[PDB]
CSV table of C-alpha atoms and ligand atoms in Angstrom, one decimal:
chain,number,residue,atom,x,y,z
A,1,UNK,CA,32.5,-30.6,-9.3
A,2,UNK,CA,29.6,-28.2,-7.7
A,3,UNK,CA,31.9,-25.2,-9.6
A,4,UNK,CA,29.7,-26.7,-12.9
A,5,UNK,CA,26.7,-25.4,-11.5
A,6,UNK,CA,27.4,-21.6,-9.7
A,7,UNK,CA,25.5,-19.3,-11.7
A,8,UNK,CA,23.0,-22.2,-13.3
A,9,UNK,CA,20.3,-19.7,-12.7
A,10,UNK,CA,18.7,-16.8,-14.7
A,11,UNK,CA,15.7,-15.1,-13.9
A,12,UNK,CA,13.2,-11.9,-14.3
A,13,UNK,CA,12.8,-10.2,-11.2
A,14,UNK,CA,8.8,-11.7,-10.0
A,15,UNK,CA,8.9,-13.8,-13.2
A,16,UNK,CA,10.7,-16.9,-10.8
A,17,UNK,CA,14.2,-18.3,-11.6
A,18,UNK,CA,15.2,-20.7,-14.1
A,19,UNK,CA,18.2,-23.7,-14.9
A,20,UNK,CA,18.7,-25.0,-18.5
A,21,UNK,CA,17.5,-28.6,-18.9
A,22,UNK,CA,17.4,-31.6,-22.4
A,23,UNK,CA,14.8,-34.0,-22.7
A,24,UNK,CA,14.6,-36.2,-25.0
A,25,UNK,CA,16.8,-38.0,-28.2
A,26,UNK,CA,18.1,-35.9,-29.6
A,27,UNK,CA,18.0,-33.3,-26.3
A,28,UNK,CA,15.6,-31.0,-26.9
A,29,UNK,CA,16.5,-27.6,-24.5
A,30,UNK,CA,14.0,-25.7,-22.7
A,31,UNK,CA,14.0,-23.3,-19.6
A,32,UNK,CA,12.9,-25.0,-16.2
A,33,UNK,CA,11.4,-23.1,-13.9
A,34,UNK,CA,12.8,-24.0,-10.1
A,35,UNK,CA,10.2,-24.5,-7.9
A,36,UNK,CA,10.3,-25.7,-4.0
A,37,UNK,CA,6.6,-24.9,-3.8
A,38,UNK,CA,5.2,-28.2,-5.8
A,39,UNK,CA,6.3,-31.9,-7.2
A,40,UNK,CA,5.3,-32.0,-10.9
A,41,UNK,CA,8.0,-32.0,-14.0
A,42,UNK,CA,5.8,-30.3,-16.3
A,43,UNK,CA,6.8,-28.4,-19.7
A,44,UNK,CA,5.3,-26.3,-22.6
A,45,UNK,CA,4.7,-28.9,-25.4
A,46,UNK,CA,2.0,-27.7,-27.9
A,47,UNK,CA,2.1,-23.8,-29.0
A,48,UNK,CA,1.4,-20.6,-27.0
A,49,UNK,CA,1.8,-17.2,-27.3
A,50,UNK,CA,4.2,-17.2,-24.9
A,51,UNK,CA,6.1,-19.9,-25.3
A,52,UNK,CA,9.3,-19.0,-27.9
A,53,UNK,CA,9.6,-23.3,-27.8
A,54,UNK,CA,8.1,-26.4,-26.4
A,55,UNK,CA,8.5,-30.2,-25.9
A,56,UNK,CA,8.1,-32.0,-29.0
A,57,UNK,CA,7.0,-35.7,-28.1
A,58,UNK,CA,6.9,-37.1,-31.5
A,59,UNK,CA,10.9,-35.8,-32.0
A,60,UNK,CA,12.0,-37.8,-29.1
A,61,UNK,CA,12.9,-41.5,-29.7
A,62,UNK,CA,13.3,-42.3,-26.0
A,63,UNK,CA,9.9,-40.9,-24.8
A,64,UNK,CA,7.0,-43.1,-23.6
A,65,UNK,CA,3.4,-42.2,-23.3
A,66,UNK,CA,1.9,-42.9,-19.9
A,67,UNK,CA,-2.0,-42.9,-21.1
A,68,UNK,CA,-3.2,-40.7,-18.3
A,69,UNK,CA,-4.2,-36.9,-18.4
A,70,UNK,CA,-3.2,-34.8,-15.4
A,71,UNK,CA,-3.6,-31.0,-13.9
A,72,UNK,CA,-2.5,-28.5,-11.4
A,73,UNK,CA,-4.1,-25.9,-10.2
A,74,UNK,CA,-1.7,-23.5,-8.2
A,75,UNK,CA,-2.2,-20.5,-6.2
A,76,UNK,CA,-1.8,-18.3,-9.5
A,77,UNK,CA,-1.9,-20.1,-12.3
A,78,UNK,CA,-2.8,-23.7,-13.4
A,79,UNK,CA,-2.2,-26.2,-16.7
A,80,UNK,CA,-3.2,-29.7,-17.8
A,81,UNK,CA,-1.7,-31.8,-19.8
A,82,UNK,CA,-0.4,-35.7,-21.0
A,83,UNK,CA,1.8,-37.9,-19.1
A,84,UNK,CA,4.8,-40.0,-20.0
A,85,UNK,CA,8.4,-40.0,-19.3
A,86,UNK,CA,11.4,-39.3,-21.1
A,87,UNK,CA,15.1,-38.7,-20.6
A,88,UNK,CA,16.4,-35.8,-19.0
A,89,UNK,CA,19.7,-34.0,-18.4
A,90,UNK,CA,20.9,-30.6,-17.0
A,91,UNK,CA,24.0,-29.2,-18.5
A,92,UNK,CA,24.9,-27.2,-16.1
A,93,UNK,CA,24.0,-29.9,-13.6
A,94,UNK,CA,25.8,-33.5,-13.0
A,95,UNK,CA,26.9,-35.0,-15.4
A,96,UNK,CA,23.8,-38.0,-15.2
A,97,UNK,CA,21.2,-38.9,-17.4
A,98,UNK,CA,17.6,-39.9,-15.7
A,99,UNK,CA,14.1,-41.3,-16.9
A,100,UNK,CA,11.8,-38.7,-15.7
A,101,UNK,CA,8.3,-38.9,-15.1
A,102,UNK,CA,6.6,-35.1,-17.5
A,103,UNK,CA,3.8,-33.5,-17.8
A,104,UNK,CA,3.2,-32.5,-21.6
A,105,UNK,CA,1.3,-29.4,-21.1
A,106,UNK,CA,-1.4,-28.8,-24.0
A,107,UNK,CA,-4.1,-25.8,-22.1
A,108,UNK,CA,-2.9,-23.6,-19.4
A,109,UNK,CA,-4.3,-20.4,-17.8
A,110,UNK,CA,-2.2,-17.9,-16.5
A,111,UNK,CA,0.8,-19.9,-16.5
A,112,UNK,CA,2.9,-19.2,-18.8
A,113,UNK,CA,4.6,-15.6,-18.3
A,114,UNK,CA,4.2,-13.3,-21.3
A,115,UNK,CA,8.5,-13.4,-22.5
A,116,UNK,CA,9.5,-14.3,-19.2
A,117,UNK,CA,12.1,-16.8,-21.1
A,118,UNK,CA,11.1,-20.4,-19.5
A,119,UNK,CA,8.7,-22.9,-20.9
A,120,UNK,CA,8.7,-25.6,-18.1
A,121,UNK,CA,8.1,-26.0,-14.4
A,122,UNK,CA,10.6,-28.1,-12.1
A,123,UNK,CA,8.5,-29.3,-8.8
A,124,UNK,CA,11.5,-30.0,-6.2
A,125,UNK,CA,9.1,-31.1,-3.3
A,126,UNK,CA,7.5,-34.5,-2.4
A,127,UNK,CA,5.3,-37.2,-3.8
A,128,UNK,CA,2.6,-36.4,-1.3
A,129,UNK,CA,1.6,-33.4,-3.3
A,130,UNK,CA,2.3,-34.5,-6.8
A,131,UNK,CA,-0.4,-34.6,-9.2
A,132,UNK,CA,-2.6,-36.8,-10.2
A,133,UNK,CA,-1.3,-38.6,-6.8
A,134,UNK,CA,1.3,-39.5,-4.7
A,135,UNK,CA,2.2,-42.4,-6.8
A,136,UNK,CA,3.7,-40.0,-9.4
A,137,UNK,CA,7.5,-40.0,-8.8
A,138,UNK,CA,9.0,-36.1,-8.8
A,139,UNK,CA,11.7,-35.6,-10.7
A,140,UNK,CA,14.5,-35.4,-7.7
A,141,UNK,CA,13.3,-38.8,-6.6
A,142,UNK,CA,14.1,-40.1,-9.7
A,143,UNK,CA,17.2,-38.3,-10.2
A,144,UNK,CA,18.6,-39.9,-6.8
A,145,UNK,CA,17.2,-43.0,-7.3
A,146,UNK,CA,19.2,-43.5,-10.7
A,147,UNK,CA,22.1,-42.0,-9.7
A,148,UNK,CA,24.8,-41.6,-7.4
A,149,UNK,CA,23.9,-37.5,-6.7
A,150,UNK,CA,23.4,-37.4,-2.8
A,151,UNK,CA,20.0,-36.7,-1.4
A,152,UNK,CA,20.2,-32.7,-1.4
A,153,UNK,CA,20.3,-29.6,-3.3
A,154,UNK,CA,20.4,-25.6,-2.2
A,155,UNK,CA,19.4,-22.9,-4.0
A,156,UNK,CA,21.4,-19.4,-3.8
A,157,UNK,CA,19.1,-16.5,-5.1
A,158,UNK,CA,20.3,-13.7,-5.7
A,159,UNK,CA,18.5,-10.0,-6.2
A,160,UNK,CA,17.7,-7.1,-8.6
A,161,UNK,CA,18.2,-9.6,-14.7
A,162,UNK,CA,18.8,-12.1,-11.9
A,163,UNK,CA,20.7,-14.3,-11.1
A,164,UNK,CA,21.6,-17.7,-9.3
A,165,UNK,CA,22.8,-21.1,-8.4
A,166,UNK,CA,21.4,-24.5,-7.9
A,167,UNK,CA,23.8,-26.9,-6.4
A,168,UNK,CA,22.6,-30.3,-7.2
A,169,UNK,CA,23.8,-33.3,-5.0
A,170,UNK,CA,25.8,-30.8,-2.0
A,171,UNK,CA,26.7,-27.5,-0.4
A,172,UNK,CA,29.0,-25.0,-2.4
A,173,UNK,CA,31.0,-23.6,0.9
A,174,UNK,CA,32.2,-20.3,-1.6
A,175,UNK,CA,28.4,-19.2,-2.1
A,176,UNK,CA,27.9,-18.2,1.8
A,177,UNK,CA,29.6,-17.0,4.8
A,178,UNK,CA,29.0,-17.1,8.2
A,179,UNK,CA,27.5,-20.8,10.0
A,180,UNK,CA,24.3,-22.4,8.3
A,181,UNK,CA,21.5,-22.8,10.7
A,182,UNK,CA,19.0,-25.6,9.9
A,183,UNK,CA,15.0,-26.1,10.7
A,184,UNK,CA,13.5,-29.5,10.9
A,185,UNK,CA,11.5,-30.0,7.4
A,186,UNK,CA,8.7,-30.5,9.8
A,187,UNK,CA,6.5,-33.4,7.3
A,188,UNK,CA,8.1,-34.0,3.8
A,189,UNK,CA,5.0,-33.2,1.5
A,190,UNK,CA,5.6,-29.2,0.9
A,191,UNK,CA,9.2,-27.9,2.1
A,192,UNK,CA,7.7,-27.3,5.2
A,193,UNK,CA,8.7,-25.8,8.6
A,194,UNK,CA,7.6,-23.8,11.8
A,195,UNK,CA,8.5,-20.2,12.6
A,196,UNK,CA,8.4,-19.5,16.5
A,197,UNK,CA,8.7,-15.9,16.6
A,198,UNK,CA,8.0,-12.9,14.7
A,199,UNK,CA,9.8,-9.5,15.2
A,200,UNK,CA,9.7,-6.1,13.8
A,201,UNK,CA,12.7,-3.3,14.3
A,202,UNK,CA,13.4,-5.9,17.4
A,203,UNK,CA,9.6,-5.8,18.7
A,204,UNK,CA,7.7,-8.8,19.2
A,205,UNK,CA,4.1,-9.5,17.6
A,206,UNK,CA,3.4,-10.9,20.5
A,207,UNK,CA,1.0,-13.8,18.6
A,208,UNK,CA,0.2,-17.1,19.5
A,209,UNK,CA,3.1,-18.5,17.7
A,210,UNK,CA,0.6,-21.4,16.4
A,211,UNK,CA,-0.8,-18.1,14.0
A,212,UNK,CA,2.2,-18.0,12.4
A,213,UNK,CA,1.9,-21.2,10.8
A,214,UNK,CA,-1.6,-21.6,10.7
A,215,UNK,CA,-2.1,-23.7,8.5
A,216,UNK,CA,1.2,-24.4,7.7
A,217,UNK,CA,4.6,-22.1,6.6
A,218,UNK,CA,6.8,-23.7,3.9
A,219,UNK,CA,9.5,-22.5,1.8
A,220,UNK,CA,8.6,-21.9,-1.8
A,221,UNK,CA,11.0,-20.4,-4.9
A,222,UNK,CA,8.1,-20.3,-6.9
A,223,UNK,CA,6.1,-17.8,-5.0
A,224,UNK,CA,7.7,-14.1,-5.1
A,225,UNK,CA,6.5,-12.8,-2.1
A,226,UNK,CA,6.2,-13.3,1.9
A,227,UNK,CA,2.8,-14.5,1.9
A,228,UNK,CA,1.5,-14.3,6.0
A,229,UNK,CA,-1.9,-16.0,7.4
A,230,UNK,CA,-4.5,-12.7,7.4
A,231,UNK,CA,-4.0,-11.9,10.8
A,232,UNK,CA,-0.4,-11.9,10.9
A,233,UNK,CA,-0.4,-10.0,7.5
A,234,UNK,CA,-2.5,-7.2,9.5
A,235,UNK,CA,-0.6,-7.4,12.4
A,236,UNK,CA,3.0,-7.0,9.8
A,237,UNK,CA,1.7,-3.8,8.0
A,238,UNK,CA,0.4,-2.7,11.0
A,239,UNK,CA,4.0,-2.2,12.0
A,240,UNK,CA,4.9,-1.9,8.7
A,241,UNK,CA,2.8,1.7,8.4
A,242,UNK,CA,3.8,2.7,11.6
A,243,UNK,CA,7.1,2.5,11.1
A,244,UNK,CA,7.1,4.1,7.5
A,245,UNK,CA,4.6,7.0,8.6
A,246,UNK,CA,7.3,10.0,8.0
A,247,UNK,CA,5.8,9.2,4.7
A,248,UNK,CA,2.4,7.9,3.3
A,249,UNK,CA,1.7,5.5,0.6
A,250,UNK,CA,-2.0,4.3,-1.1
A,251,UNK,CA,-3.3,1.8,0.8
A,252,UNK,CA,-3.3,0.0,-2.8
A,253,UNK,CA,0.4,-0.1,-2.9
A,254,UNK,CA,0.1,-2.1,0.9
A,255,UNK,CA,-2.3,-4.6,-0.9
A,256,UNK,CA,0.2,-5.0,-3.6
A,257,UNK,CA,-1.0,-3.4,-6.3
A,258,UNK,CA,-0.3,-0.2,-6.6
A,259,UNK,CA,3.4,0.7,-7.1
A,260,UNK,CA,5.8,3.8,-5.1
A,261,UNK,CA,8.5,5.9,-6.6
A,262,UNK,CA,10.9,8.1,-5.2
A,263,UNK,CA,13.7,10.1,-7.0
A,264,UNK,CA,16.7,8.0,-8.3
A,265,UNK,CA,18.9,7.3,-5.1
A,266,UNK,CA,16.4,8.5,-2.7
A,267,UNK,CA,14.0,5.8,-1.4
A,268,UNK,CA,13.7,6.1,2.3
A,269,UNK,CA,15.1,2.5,3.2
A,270,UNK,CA,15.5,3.7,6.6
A,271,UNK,CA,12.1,4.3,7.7
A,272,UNK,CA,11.3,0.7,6.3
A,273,UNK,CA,11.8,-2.1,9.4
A,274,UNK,CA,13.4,-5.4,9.8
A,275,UNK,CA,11.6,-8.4,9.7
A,276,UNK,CA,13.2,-11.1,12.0
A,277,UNK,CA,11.5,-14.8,11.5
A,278,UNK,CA,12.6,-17.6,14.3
A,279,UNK,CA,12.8,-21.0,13.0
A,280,UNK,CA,12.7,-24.2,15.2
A,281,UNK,CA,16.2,-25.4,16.0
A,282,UNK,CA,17.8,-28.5,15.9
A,283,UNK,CA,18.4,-29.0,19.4
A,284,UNK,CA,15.4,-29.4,22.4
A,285,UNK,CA,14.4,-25.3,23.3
A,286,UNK,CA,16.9,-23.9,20.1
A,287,UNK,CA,15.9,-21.6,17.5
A,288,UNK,CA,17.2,-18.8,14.9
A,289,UNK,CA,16.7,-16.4,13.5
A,290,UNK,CA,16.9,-14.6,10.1
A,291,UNK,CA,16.8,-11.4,9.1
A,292,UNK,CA,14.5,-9.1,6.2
A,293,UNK,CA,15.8,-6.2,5.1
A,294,UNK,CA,13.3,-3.8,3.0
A,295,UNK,CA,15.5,-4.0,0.0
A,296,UNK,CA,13.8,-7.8,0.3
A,297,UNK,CA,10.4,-7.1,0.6
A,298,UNK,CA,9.9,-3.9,-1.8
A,299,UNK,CA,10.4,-5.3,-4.9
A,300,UNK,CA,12.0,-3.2,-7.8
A,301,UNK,CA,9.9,-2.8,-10.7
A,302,UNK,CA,10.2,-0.5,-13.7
A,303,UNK,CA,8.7,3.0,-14.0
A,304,UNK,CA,5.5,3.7,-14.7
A,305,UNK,CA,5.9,7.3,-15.6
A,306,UNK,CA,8.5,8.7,-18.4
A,307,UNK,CA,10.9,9.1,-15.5
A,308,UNK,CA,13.9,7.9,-14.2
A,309,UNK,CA,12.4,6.9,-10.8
A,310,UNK,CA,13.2,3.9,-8.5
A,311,UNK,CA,9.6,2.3,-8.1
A,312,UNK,CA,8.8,-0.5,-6.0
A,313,UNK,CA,6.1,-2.9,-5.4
A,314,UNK,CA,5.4,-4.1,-1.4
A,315,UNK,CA,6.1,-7.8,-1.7
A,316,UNK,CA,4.3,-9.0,1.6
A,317,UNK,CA,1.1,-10.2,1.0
A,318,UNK,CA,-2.1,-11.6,2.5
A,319,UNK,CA,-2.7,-15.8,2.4
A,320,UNK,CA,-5.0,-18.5,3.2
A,321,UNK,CA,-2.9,-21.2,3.5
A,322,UNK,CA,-0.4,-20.2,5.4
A,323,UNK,CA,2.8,-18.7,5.7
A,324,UNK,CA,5.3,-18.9,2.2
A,325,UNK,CA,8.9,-18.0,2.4
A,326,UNK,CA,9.3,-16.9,-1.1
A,327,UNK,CA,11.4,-16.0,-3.2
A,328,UNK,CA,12.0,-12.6,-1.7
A,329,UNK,CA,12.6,-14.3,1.8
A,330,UNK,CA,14.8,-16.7,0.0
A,331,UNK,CA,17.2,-14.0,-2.1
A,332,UNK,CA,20.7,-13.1,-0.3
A,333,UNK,CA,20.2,-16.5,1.8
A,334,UNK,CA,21.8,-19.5,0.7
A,335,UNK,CA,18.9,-21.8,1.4
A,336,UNK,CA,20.4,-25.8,2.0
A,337,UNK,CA,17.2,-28.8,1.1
A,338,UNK,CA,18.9,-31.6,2.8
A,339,UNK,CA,16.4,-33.9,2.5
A,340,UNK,CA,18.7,-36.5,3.8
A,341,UNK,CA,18.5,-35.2,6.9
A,342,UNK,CA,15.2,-34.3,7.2
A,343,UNK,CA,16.2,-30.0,7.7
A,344,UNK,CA,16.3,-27.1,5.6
A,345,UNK,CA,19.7,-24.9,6.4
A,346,UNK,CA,20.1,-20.8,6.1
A,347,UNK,CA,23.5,-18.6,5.7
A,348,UNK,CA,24.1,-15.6,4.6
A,349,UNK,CA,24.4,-15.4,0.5
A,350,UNK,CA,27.6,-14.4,-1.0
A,351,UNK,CA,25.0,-12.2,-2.9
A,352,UNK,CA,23.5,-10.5,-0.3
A,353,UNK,CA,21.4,-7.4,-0.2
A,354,UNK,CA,23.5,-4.2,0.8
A,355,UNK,CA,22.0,-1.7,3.2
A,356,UNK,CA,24.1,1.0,4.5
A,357,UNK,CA,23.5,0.8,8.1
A,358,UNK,CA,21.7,-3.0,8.9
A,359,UNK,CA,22.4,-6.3,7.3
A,360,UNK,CA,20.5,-9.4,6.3
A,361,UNK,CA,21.2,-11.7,9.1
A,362,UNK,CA,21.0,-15.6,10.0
A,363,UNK,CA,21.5,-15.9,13.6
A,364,UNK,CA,21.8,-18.1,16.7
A,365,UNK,CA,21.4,-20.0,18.6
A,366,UNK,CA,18.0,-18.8,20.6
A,367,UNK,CA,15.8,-20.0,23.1
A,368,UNK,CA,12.6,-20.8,22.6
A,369,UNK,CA,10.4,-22.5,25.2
A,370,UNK,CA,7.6,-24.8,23.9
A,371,UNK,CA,8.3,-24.9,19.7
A,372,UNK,CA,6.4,-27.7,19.4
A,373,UNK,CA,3.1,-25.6,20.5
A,374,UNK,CA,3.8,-23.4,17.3
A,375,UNK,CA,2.7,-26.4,14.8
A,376,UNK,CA,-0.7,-26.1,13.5
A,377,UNK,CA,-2.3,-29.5,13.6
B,401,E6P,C1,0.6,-27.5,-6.9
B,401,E6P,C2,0.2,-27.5,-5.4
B,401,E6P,C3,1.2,-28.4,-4.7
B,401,E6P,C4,0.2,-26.1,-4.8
B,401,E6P,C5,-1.1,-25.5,-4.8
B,401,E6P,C6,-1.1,-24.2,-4.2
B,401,E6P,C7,0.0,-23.6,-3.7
B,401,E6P,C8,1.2,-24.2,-3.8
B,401,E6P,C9,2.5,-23.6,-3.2
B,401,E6P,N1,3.5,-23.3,-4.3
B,401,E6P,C10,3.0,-22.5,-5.4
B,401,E6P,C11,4.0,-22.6,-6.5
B,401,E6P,O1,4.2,-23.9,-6.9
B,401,E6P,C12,3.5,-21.8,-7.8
B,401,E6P,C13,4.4,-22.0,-9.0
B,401,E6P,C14,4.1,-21.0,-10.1
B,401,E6P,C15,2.8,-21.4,-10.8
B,401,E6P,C16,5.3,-21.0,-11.1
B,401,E6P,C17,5.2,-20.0,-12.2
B,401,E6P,O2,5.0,-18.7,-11.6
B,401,E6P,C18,6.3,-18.0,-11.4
B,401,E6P,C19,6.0,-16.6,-11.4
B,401,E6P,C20,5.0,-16.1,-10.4
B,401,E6P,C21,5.5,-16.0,-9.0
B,401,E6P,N2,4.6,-15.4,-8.0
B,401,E6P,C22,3.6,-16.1,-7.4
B,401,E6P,C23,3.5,-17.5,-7.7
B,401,E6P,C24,2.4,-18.2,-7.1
B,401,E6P,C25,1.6,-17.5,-6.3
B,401,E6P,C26,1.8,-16.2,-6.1
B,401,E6P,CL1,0.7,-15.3,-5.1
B,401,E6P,N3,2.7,-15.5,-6.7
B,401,E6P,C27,2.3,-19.7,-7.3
B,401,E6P,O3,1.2,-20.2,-7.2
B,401,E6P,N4,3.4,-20.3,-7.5
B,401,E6P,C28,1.3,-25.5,-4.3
């Protein structure tokens, strides 16, 4: 029945990627933002500029108020809001009904997304980083607690306006090819994992590996970009500029900012490198690896100019708490959350990004002496 749900997804390219959800009697329908990065069901449901509708408690006849405030403050972005639960289904999702603990949001700051066409947020990781406290049950542990829907979910994101799938309950086998290759969800708070190696055009940083997850490296469709601890983001563009030197950019556009253009049809993607991240295995000294094209990690974005340019922003970026695998890491892999298990599993996307001489890659398996040295503790 996981047919119901390819192509659940819509999105705006840096704007994060949305499935069609009801809460309420009678169901009221909002957009739901997808989000690995965080644990709270939270929705639009007083007015905002930016918000074309919202959750209307007093419409509902199966909501409850839960008589506690609550507020997250992410990376960009944060709301606040009212607690209480109500009913929720996804249409294009099994067929189930589930009491969910949501957020009612009433303030926000820099949340909301001026018409980027979704008015809620869906947190998809664990209790332990829920707001107010761990005691607030996420939606998925609901959802498999009062149902049958297996104990897993996998997100296929697709590229440059978007597009996806979010397989509820299993593995659609027709959205990848190639073998899946899983990493140990290394503690089940964020999605969160340890990369052992970094290479660039096949060269080796050459870092303690502990750097690359310092503090820690999750997986995280809310954030768009590949977000690296400050000294492996120096190391990366390093590389990066080395590599791309035939031509020269503003250093603004390398802190994100500033955007390039070439001529329709003409962007150099050969001069850009590879990025090859090596995940932690399943078996003792085994790892993979997969593979970043530039079409990943320079973003499209529209013209700035009256012209009919292809501009692009650079979608790496510098962190301070450690490594995320977003959305641009995640796009042409089929990305498997079996939470079951304990492992998060990468193929190839049927929708995978088309160079003309290199392809996005998942490969193994590798050895890799002394993984367990690469967690940050
Ligand atoms: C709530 C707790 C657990 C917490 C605190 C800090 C970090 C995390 C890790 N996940 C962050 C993720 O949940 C969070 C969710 C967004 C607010 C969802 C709406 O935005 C989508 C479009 C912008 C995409 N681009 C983006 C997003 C974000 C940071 C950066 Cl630099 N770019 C970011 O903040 N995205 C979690």
């Amino acid at each position: 029945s996981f047919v119901e749900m390819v192509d659940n997804l819509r999105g705006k390219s840096g704007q994060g990627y949305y499935v069609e959800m009801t809460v309420g009697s009678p169901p009221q329908t909002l957009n739901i933002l997808v989000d690995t990065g965080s644990s709270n069901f939270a929705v639009g449901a007083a007015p905002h500029p930016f918000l074309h509708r919202y959750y209307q408690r007093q419409l509902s006849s199966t909501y409850r108020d839960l008589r506690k405030g609550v507020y997250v403050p992410y990376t960009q972005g944060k709301w606040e809001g009212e607690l209480g639960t109500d009913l929720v289904s996804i249409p294009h999702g099994p067929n189930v009904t589930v009491r969910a603990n949501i957020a009612a949001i009433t303030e926000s700051d820099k949340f909301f997304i001026n018409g980027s066409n979704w008015e809620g947020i869906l947190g998809l990781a664990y209790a332990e980083i829920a707001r107010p406290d761990d005691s607030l049950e996420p939606f998925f542990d609901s959802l498999v607690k009062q149902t049958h829907v297996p104990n897993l979910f996998s997100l296929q994101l697709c590229g440059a306006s978007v597009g996806g799938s979010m397989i509820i309950g299993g593995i659609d086998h027709s959205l990848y090819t190639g073998s899946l290759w899983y990493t140990p969800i290394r503690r089940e708070w964020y999605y969160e994992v340890i990369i052992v190696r970094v290479e660039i055009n096949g060269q080796d940083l050459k870092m303690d590996c502990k750097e690359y997850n310092y503090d820690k490296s999750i997986v995280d469709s809310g954030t768009t970009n590949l977000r690296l601890p400050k000294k492996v983001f120096e190391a990366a563009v390093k590389s990066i500029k080395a590599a791309s030197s035939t031509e020269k950019f503003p250093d603004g556009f390398w802190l994100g900012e500033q955007l390039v253009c070439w001529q329709a049809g003409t962007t150099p993607w050969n001069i850009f490198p590879v990025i090859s991240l090596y995940l932690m295995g399943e078996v003792t000294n085994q790892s993979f690896r997969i593979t970043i094209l530039p079409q990943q990690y320079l973003r499209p974005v529209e013209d700035v100019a009256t012209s009919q340019d292809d501009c692009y922003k650079f979608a790496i970026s510098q962190s301070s708490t450690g490594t995320v695998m977003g959305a641009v890491i995640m796009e042409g892999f089929y990305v498997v959350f079996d939470r079951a298990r304990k492992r998060i599993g990468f193929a190839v996307s049927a929708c995978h990004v088309h160079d003309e001489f290199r392809t996005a890659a998942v490969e193994g398996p590798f050895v890799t002496l002394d993984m367990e040295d690469c967690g940050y503790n």
